[PDB]
Amino acid sequence: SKARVYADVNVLRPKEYWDYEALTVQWGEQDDYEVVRKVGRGKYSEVFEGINVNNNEKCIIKILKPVKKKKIKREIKILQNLCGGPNIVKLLDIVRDQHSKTPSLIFEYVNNTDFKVLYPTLTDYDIRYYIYELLKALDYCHSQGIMHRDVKPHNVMIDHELRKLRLIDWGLAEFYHPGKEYNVRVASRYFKGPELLVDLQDYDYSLDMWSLGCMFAGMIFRKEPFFYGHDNHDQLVKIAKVLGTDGLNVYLNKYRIELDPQLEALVGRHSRKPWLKFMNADNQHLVSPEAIDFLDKLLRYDHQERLTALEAMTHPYFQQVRAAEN
Numbered sequence: 001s002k003a004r005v006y007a008d009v010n011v012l013r014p015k016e017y018w019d020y021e022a023l024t025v026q027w028g029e030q031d032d033y034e035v036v037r038k039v040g041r042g043k044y045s046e047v048f049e050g051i052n053v054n055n056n057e058k059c060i061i062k063i064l065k066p067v068k069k070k071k072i073k074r075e076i077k078i079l080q081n082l083c084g085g086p087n088i089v090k091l092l093d094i095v096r097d098q099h100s101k102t103p104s105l106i107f108e109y110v111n112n113t114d115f116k117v118l119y120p121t122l123t124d125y126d127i128r129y130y131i132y133e134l135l136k137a138l139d140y141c142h143s144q145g146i147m148h149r150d151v152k153p154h155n156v157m158i159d160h161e162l163r164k165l166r167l168i169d170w171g172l173a174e175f176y177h178p179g180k181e182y183n184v185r186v187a188s189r190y191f192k193g194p195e196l197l198v199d200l201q202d203y204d205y206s207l208d209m210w211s212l213g214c215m216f217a218g219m220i221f222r223k224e225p226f227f228y229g230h231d232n233h234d235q236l237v238k239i240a241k242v243l244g245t246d247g248l249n250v251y252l253n254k255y256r257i258e259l260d261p262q263l264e265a266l267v268g269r270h271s272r273k274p275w276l277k278f279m280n281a282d283n284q285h286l287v288s289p290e291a292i293d294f295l296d297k298l299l300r301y302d303h304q305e306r307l308t309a310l311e312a313m314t315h316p317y318f319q320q321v322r323a324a325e326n
């Protein structure tokens with residue numbers, strides 16, 4: 001299996017571009033940046049609104065928890081490679097504590113509203129707009145040879161007033177190389193593509209399109225997370241109970257994959273549930289044939305069948321957003 005688009009990006013570029021292990025970091029001044037207030041946290045970092053003391057401008061200070069240096073340089077390399085791309089978070093500086101050497105990444109500040117509060121207020125038009133903005137970021141990183149591998153609302157910062165969106169947390173992102181077998185313990189459970197869940201390791205940028213599909217279903221159906229598995233086995237069961245097992249079977253057969261007996265037994269057999277069965281009084285104003293058609297084209301078991309980010313942006317679902325831009 002191989003990407004249908006941008007498969008040669010890292011092939012054609014100098015090794016300096018994707019060989020992140022050979023990076024030697026230029027450390028800035030730790031004292032340029034002061035923590036103002038904690039805003040976020042996760043397994044690998046803590047995140048603070050900060051102040052650049054030279055120019056009194058806001059910034060984000062992402063303090064990294066202990067991890068292998070390889071992973072730090074990977075995230076730094078990918079951020080440098082993508083800095084300036086549409087809707088990609090801007091890495092501004094890289095600094096460290098002198099005594100403990102704990103690194104922090106300094107980013108542009110985005111005046112975010114949390115998705116659990118923001119999304120329920122978004123009109124049908126806003127959903128189209130912000131998803132279009134997120135697609136610009138994904139097509140860009142894909143075009144630059146990078147898979148994000150952790151698309152989810154928690155990693156999409158939205159300053160709603162300015163209608164500004166940024167794709168953040170590149171800490172699980174990787175360079176795409178034709179034929180490479182990747183770790184499948186990426187993404188957050190509710191957003192893991194079937195490839196991850198059945199152990200297909202030669203995946204590509206299309207993994208992000210599945211994750212975007214999950215985010216999008218959660219928005220239009222007002223069911224967050226859309227596929228709510230308690231563990232990775234359960235996650236595949238939850239998918240199969242919507243897409244149906246006949247489709248899973250064709251998929252597995254195509255890529256010569258068999259499930260673990262325990263996993264196979266848990267998935268069982270399930271008819272496909274048509275998308276309209278998720279419409280209700282709460283989500284009615286958001287669910288249209290174009291939304292459904294676009295969703296259907298993202299949530300396919302076969303990663304090769306999913307729309308690319310570039311095709312996604314051209315879907316008639318976005319035609320109003322494109323017209324506003326043109």
Ligand SMILES: O=c1cc(-c2ccc(O)c(O)c2)oc2cc(O)cc(O)c12
Nearest residue numbers: 039040060089107109110112168169170
């Ligand atoms: O502007 C924000 C920027 C970031 C951020 C930026 C880059 C990252 O690699 C990351 O992991 C988080 O994270 C936030 C997290 C928040 O809760 C609120 C925010 O405004 C931000």
